[PDB]
Design a protein around this ligand. Structure first.
Ligand SMILES: CCCCCCCCCCCCCCCCCC(=O)OC[C@H](COP(=O)([O-])OCC[N+](C)(C)C)OC(=O)CCCCCCCCCCCCCCCCC
Ligand SMILES: CCCCCCCCCCCCCCCCCC(=O)OC[C@H](COP(=O)([O-])OCC[N+](C)(C)C)OC(=O)CCCCCCCCCCCCCCCCC
Ligand SMILES: CC(C)CCC[C@@H](C)[C@H]1CC[C@H]2[C@@H]3CC=C4C[C@@H](OC(=O)CCC(=O)O)CC[C@]4(C)[C@H]3CC[C@]12C
Ligand SMILES: CC(C)CCC[C@@H](C)[C@H]1CC[C@H]2[C@@H]3CC=C4C[C@@H](OC(=O)CCC(=O)O)CC[C@]4(C)[C@H]3CC[C@]12C
Ligand SMILES: */C(=S)=N/C1=[C]C(S([O])(=O)=O)=C(/[C]=[C]/C2=C(S([O])(=O)=O)[C]=C(N=C=S)[C]=[C]2)[C]=[C]1
Ligand SMILES: */C(=S)=N/C1=[C]C(S([O])(=O)=O)=C(/[C]=[C]/C2=C(S([O])(=O)=O)[C]=C(N=C=S)[C]=[C]2)[C]=[C]1
Ligand SMILES: *[C@@H]1O[C@H](CO)[C@@H](O[C@@H]2O[C@H](CO)[C@@H](O)[C@H](O)[C@H]2NC(C)=O)[C@H](O)[C@H]1NC(C)=O
Ligand SMILES: *[C@@H]1O[C@H](CO)[C@@H](O[C@@H]2O[C@H](CO)[C@@H](O)[C@H](O)[C@H]2NC(C)=O)[C@H](O)[C@H]1NC(C)=O
Ligand SMILES: CC(C)CCC[C@@H](C)[C@H]1CC[C@H]2[C@@H]3CC=C4C[C@@H](O)CC[C@]4(C)[C@H]3CC[C@]12C
Ligand SMILES: CC(C)CCC[C@@H](C)[C@H]1CC[C@H]2[C@@H]3CC=C4C[C@@H](O)CC[C@]4(C)[C@H]3CC[C@]12C
Ligand SMILES: CC(C)CCC[C@@H](C)[C@H]1CC[C@H]2[C@@H]3CC=C4C[C@@H](O)CC[C@]4(C)[C@H]3CC[C@]12C
Ligand SMILES: CC(C)CCC[C@@H](C)[C@H]1CC[C@H]2[C@@H]3CC=C4C[C@@H](O)CC[C@]4(C)[C@H]3CC[C@]12C
Ligand SMILES: CC(C)CCC[C@@H](C)[C@H]1CC[C@H]2[C@@H]3CC=C4C[C@@H](O)CC[C@]4(C)[C@H]3CC[C@]12C
Ligand SMILES: CC(C)CCC[C@@H](C)[C@H]1CC[C@H]2[C@@H]3CC=C4C[C@@H](O)CC[C@]4(C)[C@H]3CC[C@]12C
Lengths: 516, 516
């Protein structure tokens, strides 16, 4: 009944993952029949689409359109469908992540200097990824995930929420920089790719649209837990809170005629970003020049970095989502999900498309959206495969449905990202204890780590975790940002060898507890 | 011990008002020693100044500067000081009101058509006002205030809060109309009296400044009642919540350089608005032409309307403020306050300055600001004469302190007015029952009118009051807006003769109760 356990047989953990979950397959279809599930699809679609559009454009720039938006929309769609149908935890949301973009910029630059075909180079990384994951899953290497405690989990989940919130505000500020509040503006600026010079009212409306969307989202959640209107109506308006918030502020922008705001932009059709550079299928041996044999072997080194990047964020995401506290009964599979994510990623390379990963903020948003609230306590979660399938299909079709998307401002979606980031800081005990730094000890809750631990020692423990977050944020800022996963790893030694010198066993049990 | 009681002796009620309150005079000075009282001064100053600036300008326009801002600042100041020192209820805030402006426009128009000296005409209204109030106070006519029940009080207090909120939003919308969000503007526009044409970023920044100020104000009140920080620090930051909210958003505007926003504007010095038309002292018999004898007698008719206008709003304001629910022990005086307000107003006329009135939203704001919260229940009120004195003095000096005021945006103060309007809808039982229309009857409070009255009959009673508010709002909208006081009066018949046909005695006791 314990997922993270070494059996002895090859592919032991994987067979136990399939046998565990696939019996519930029909339930994974019939549980989706609920308007809450539909409200979840609409929400998580916009969560899933905007990153693909944003990161896809950054790949286009950094890579000379050898990979761009089209490639990432297709990858996100196809890998999204396959994972929704075959995966052990369907509530995970596979997609491109900041760390993966950083690597792609890094590997491109290497190939420019050394005179390699970048897109052909990725194919060999992809072959090594397939070889690595089939070895790991064979010898049941996912069992090591059991040594990642709450301590490391909450440092990770908290950092990822802060970064998410930080980047959203960075995007708002960019608008102000591009379109500053001036006395006079040139009034013949071209709009062909984008506004050439600054224009009036764009930055302040963007702020209003953002602040508007966030407010309605937060208010309709407050309303959901209120005692106004009949419960059946109040629950439904609460479920569709985010889609209502979006629809309101999208109509606000629609009626405001003469003021410019940035809209979502998908590619024209389904075709590679640079048609001259590459086709659909990338040749291993080379496109123009012969691919060198040393790099076919040397690609093993980048493959290990990409593996670790995908593994850590994906397996920790799974831990966070599949916690006992959140009422998920169907069962998670670490062995099966690893194989699909990394396996599909290795194959994607061969069609010049990005390998993806189970991303934390989106996956957690998706899981929270399907959670029903009793009395406030968690009653159950709507664990099904339809939400994840429909979002993957919609992201794929997004190119066809440009007429709808071309009327949605980004500023509106920034409000929904602010909502997602804030809402994600919920069951994290780190955040709870950080708040108790500011409350006096009289008005502290009756949770075990308050009663059984002295207030200053509890605070010392919180402070040490805050110092970890600081060190992680500094490494983030420096050029060596691909090290972040390997610095998270060091949080496991800290907890296991260092902290027991300072804190006694009884304190470390209550503070860093498995089930709470 | 009952204020509203007929003794038999001439000036009986007045002597009992003075004997009651003036024993507490030293306490009315030493109770002001508290930072809460200082935070109240700063708040109520801006509440008191902006109306005087706004209404003063409208008088300037409507009256050809025979009365303007200077006259109303001086009147508000002098009458404010005298009332703070001599009055029976010092928490009342005397000033100009919308109804009074309407009358002044009306009386001016009459004098233009009939060929009378408007400013000389007011002097005779003022003489009649002095004669009326000395008769009323002699024969103890303020005793009739006891027949104004909760029913009429809450219809009045609710209407006045709605109008207040409506007018604030009307001012924001005017900014958008003056400075619309267009694609191209003209930049050679002049700013000598005010912006001639529309300007970019002005309307959306005004909205942000307003929405900003309101948010901080509401959040710092939430914080006051929270369990964060040490209580002594949390209480102080809660007390100075509004002055902090103002200071924040005033600094936001300060650093934003090139964008235009409207600022507070006081007159240059202490001098009459139109020096040619009038001097400081107005001659009864006439300035240029001889004032006619028929109008010296006919002025009795306008005097009755002005009396009723001032009496009703001032005496109902006193009822609302001096309720048992609000812990005010010092004691209110209806006979003394009436004499001062209307007496001072009659004399003001002789110096060509406006008669004023105890205004509801400001007085209620002032009283709430001085209320301390135990545990949430009302512990006590800081009843003193210093708050009201300092605000009256500051309004007088406002002309001298133009350098400070010229950096305060109005948009910021609109946020504080929104806060005042919302906060004023608090202890009104009408508002409470209007909210229960939307709650299901399971989640209704254990107040007597819920237990002892059937839910639909309670709702029928609420609905009849909503129909009164509607009828009052329609009369407001029509040209005959000076009738509003006389339509409020009819709410007393409704309660006393009509409602007891529909509702039984037991229901009317619980619904419309004196102490609750
Ligand atoms: C805790 C609460 C504090 C935060 C408040 C909520 C978040 C902050 C953002 C406010 C939401 C605003 C969204 C709409 C803004 C529209 C702006 C614009 O383009 O103007 C349109 C229009 C201009 O476009 P137009 O359509 O009139 O132009 C006419 C041209 N034709 C005819 C061709 C179409 O502006 C106006 O005319 C005025 C409209 C009102 C605008 C502002 C209303 C905002 C109300 C909210 C007040 C906030 C304070 C707090 C309220 C708390 C409630 C309890
Ligand atoms: C339950 C919660 C309800 C929350 C409701 C929503 C918030 C209500 C407040 C309304 C918006 C007020 C914005 C702040 C005021 C300053 C804005 C301004 O004009 O500055 C522009 C400033 C100044 O513009 P500038 O033209 O002077 O340029 C600045 C650069 N220099 C100095 C070199 C010239 O520009 C900025 O750079 C951007 C700052 C943007 C404002 C900060 C982000 C806020 C976004 C909304 C957040 C939503 C609520 C979050 C709540 C968290 C709690 C859960
Ligand atoms: C932002 C980055 C740079 C980290 C800083 C985080 C702080 C919130 C942390 C770090 C260390 C913590 C402190 C570690 C040690 C102490 C001493 C402790 O007092 C005693 O030793 C108690 C007396 C006793 O020994 O019985 C009181 C809490 C305090 C100040 C802690 C409060 C919270 C602190 C300041
Ligand atoms: C004046 C304009 C702006 C409309 C706003 C007024 C409404 C909010 C009020 C007016 C009369 C009220 C109604 C008066 C009578 C009834 C019937 C009552 O049901 C019964 O009496 C049915 C028989 C029974 O249950 O005994 C339910 C409440 C209701 C709809 C009241 C609800 C609130 C109403 C519609
Ligand atoms: C756009 S959208 N801006 C944006 C958004 C994000 S995200 O994915 O958080 O919405 C990012 C991602 C940043 C990120 C990093 S990075 O790139 O700053 O090193 C690292 C990690 N992982 C760890 S530990 C997570 C997210 C960038 C830009
Ligand atoms: C400016 S400030 N605008 C503004 C503000 C107010 S305020 O603050 O005094 O509410 C008013 C006043 C309106 C008002 C009326 S009126 O003028 O609309 O007839 C009547 C009553 N009384 C009754 S019953 C109270 C207030 C106008 C403009
Ligand atoms: C599309 O692909 C062509 C072919 O690679 C790119 O051409 C490159 O141009 C950059 C400068 O922008 C040079 O550094 C390379 O040497 C060029 N490559 C070759 C072999 O021609 C072009 O940049 C790409 N355009 C897009 C869409 O980004
Ligand atoms: C200042 O006072 C003079 C004197 O009353 C005002 O002159 C009036 O002008 C209006 C037209 O605006 C005429 O209808 C009146 O007949 C004039 N009155 C007289 C007797 O001359 C002038 O309007 C006032 N100016 C200000 C500051 O409003
Ligand atoms: C193209 C290839 C290399 C990539 C895909 C990975 C392949 C090799 C993986 C995916 C699923 C795996 C199988 C899943 C389950 C079982 C049943 C077990 O009793 C024996 C091993 C066996 C039969 C596995 C062998 C290896 C396997 C077929
Ligand atoms: C396209 C962007 C701009 C906005 C998307 C919002 C749309 C899809 C949302 C907003 C509110 C939603 C509705 C809200 C409530 C219900 C009741 C439920 O029992 C059936 C679905 C239904 C009828 C929803 C349908 C979808 C809906 C119309
Ligand atoms: C309905 C569900 C299952 C599918 C959703 C995704 C669909 C619409 C997407 C995903 C990948 C896409 C394909 C990717 C590549 C090609 C090759 C090109 O030469 C023709 C278009 C074509 C064939 C695309 C058409 C649309 C496509 C099939
Ligand atoms: C002039 C306009 C723009 C803003 C006015 C705000 C000023 C007067 C307010 C803002 C915050 C206030 C301070 C907040 C808290 C305290 C602590 C108290 O124990 C003494 C007064 C003192 C020190 C206040 C002094 C006045 C103050 C500085
Ligand atoms: C215009 C207003 C402000 C002033 C004019 C009102 C005058 C006439 C009022 C104000 C105070 C009044 C006095 C208050 C107290 C007393 C004591 C009593 O035993 C006999 C009446 C007597 C002596 C009153 C007579 C009238 C009085 C003097
Ligand atoms: C500080 C407290 C006690 C008083 C507050 C209000 C003060 C500043 C106001 C109220 C009445 C005002 C006066 C009204 C009339 C005149 C006559 C004029 O020819 C010169 C200015 C002068 C003399 C004003 C100066 C300022 C003044 C005294």
């Amino acid at each position: 009944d314990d997922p993270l356990q070494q059996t002895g047989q090859l592919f032991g953990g994987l067979v136990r993952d399939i046998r565990r979950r696939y019996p519930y397959y029909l339930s994974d279809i019939t549980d989706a029949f609920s308007p809450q599930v539909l409200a979840a699809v609409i929400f998580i679609y916009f969560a899933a689409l905007s990153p693909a559009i944003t990161f896809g454009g950054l790949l286009g720039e950094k890579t000379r359109n050898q990979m761009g938006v089209s490639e990432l929309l297709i990858s996100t769609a196809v890998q999204g469908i396959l994972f929704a149908l075959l995966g052990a935890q369907p509530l995970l949301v596979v997609g491109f992540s900041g760390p993966l973009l950083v690597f792609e910029e890094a590997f491109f630059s290497f190939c420019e200097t050394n005179g390699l075909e970048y897109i052909v180079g990725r194919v060999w990384i992809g072959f090594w990824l397939i070889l690595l994951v089939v070895l790991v899953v064979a010898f049941e290497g996912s069992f090591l995930v059991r040594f990642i405690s709450r301590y490391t989990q909450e440092i990770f989940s908290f950092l990822i929420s802060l970064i998410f919130i930080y980047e959203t505000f960075s995007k708002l500020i960019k608008i102000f920089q591009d379109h500053p509040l001036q006395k006079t503006y040139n009034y013949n600026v071209l709009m062909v790719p984008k506004p050439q010079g600054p224009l009036p009212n764009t930055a302040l409306l963007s702020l209003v649209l953002m602040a508007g969307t966030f407010f309605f989202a937060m208010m309709l959640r407050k309303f959901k837990n209120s005692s106004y209107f009949p419960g059946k109506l109040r629950r439904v308006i609460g479920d569709f809170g985010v889609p209502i918030s979006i629809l309101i502020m999208v109509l606000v922008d629609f009626f405001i005629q003469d003021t410019y705001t940035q809209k979502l932009s998908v590619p024209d059709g389904f075709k590679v970003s640079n048609s001259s550079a590459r086709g659909w299928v990338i040749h291993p041996l080379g496109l123009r020049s012969e691919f060198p044999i040393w790099m076919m072997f040397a690609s093993a080194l980048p493959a290990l970095l990409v593996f670790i990047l995908i593994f850590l964020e994906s397996q920790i995401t799974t831990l966070i989502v599949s916690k006992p506290e959140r009422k998920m009964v169907k069962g998670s599979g670490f062995h099966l999900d690893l194989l699909l994510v990394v396996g599909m990623g290795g194959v994607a390379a061969l069609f010049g498309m990005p390998w993806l990963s189970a991303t934390t903020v989106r996956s957690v948003t998706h899981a929270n959206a399907l959670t029903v609230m009793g009395k406030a306590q968690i009653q159950e979660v709507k664990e099904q495969r339809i939400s994840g399938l429909l979002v993957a299909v919609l992201v794929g079709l997004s190119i066809l449905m440009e007429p709808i998307l071309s009327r949605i401002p980004l500023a509106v979606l920034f409000g929904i990202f602010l909502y997602m980031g804030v809402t994600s800081l919920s069951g994290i005990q780190l955040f709870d204890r950080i708040l108790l730094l500011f409350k006096p000890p009289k008005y502290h809750p009756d949770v075990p780590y308050v009663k059984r631990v002295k207030t200053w020692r509890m605070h010392l423990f919180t402070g040490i975790q805050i110092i970890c977050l600081a060190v992680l944020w500094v490494v983030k800022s420096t050029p060596a940002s691909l090290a972040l996963p390997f610095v998270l790893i060091l949080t496991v030694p800290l907890r296991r060898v260092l902290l027991p010198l300072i804190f006694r066993n009884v304190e470390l049990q209550c503070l860093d507890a498995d089930d709470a």
